[PDB]
C-alpha positions as a printed Julia matrix, in Angstrom:
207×3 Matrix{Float64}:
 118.27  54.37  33.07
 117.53  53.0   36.49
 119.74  50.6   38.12
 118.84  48.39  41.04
 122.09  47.87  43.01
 121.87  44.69  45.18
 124.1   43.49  47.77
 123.9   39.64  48.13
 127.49  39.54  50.17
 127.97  38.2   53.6
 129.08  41.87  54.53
 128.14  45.32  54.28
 129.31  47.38  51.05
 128.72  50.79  50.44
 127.49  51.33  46.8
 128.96  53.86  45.07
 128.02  55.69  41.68
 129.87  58.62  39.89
 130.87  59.8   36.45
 134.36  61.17  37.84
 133.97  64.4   37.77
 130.04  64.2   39.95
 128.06  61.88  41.74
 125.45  59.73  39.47
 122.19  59.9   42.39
 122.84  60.15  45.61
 126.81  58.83  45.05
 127.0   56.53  47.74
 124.69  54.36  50.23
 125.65  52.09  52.96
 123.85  48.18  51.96
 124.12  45.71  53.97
 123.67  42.34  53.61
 120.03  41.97  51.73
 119.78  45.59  50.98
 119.14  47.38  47.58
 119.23  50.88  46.41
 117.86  51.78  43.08
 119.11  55.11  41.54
 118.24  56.84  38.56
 120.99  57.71  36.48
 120.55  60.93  33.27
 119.9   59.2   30.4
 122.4   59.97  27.61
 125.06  59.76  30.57
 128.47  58.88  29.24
 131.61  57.01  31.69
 129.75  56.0   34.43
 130.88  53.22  37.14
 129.21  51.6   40.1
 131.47  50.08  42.83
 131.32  48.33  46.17
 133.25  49.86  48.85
 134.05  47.35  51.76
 135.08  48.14  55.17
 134.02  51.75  55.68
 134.25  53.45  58.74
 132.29  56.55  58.38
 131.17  59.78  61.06
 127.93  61.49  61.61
 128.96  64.17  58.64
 129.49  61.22  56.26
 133.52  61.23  56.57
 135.81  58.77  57.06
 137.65  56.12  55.35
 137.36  52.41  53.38
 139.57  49.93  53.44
 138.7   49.64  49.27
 137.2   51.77  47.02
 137.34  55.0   49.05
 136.38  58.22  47.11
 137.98  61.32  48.92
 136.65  59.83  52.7
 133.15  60.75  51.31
 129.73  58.24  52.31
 128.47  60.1   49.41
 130.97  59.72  46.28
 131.35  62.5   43.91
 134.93  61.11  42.32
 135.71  57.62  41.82
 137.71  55.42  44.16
 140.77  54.23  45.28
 141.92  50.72  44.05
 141.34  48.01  44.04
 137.69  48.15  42.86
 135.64  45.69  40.58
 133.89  48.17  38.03
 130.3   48.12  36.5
 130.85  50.91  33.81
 128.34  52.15  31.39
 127.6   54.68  28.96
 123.97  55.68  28.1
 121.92  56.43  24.67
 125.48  56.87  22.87
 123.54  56.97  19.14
 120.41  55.01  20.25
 122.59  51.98  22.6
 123.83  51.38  25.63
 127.45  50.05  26.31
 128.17  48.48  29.57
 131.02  46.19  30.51
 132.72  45.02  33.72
 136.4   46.16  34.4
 139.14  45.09  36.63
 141.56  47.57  35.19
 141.48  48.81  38.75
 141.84  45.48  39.82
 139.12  43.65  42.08
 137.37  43.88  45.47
 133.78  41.95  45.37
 132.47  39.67  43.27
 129.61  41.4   40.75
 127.45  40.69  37.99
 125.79  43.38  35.96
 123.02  42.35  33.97
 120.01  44.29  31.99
 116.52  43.89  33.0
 115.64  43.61  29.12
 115.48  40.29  26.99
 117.72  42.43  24.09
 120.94  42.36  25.56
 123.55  39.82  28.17
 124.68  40.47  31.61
 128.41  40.11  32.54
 129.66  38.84  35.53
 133.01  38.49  37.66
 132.46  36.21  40.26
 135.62  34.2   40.85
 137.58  34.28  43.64
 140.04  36.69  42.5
 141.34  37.77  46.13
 141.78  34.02  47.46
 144.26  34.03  43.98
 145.96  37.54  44.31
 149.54  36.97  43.24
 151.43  38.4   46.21
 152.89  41.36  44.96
 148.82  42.61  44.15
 147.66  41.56  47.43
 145.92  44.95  48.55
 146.6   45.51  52.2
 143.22  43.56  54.32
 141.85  42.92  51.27
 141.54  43.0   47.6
 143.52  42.58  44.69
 145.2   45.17  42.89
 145.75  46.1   38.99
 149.59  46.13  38.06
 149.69  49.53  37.21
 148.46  50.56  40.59
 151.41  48.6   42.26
 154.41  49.81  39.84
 152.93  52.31  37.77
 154.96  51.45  34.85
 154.4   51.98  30.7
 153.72  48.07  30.5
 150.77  48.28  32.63
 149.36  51.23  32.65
 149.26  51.68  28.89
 149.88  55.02  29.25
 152.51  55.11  25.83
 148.94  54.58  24.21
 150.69  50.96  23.11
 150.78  48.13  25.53
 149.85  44.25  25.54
 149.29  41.91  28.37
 151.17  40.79  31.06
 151.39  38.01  33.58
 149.15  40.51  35.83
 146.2   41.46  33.29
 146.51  37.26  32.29
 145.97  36.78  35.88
 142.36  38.64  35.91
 141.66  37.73  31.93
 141.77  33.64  32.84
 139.58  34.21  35.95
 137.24  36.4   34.11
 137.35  36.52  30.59
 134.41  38.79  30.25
 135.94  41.55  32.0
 138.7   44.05  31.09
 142.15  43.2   32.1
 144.39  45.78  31.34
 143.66  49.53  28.96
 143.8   47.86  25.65
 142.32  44.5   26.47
 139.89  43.4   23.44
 136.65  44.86  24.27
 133.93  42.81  26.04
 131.5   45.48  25.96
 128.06  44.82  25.59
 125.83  46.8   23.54
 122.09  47.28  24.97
 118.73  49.28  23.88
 118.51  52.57  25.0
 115.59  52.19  27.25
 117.49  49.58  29.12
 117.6   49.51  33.23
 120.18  47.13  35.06
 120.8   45.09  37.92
 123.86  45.16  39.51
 124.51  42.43  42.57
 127.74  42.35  44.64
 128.1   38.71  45.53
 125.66  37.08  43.27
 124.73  33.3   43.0
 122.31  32.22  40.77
């Protein structure tokens, strides 16, 4: 599938795209405000995320750091980043579909929408101002906000006994953005698309 990533914000982001374990494309690409990059990603890909980054400071050699969403200090991401990070996550030609969804699992940074170019499927969109609300104890430092199990890495949020429900933190995310995953074990709100779908996905989007 190819997916045009737009950045619409006021500010620079640097797009990033991996499947954990390698980069999807080129991995990462500085946008600012107005630009695009479009990447091809392997069809029949499986656990794949796109991400803003904001605040990057990055060297000639591509090192350095961002304030959210860093992936090792690397321009050009080949893992997937630090929280908090607003997640467009996909898996490709699983059995003829496409699955896509937007997470804040690893809480939010930039407001996204990720939406098919095809007339067979919705987009999804988190677009509220989820930072402006950040309960204090999530407040990531200069910006973001972060997922509970981040900030106490506990059972209760992480879901890591394999059996959790949610909290006053996941709620918090849910009621701003009920079509995005709060916590592990939220009910789905994945998508299911054709298999020759492409996507859009815009950091700050309006209309």
């Amino acid at each position: 599938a190819t997916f045009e990533i737009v950045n619409r914000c006021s500010y620079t982001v640097w797009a990033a795209a991996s499947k954990g374990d390698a980069a999807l494309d080129a991995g990462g690409r500085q946008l600012n405000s107005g630009e695009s990059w479009t990447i091809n990603v392997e069809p029949g890909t499986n656990g794949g995320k796109i991400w803003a980054r904001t605040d990057c400071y990055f060297d000639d050699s591509g090192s350095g750091i961002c304030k959210t969403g860093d992936c090792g200090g690397l321009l050009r991401c080949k893992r997937f980043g630090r929280p908090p990070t607003t997640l467009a996550e996909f898996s490709l030609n699983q059995y003829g579909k496409d699955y896509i969804d937007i997470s804040n699992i690893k809480g939010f940074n930039v407001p996204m929408d990720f939406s098919p170019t095809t007339r067979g499927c919705r987009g999804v969109r988190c677009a509220a101002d989820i930072v402006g609300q950040c309960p204090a104890k999530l407040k990531a430092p200069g910006g973001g906000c972060n997922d509970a199990c981040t900030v106490f890495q506990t059972s209760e949020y992480c879901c890591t006994t394999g059996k959790c429900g949610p909290t006053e933190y996941s709620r918090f995310f849910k009621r701003l953005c009920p079509d995005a995953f709060s916590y592990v074990l939220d009910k789905p709100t994945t998508v299911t698309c054709p298999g020759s779908s492409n996507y859009r996905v815009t950091f700050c989007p309006t209309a």
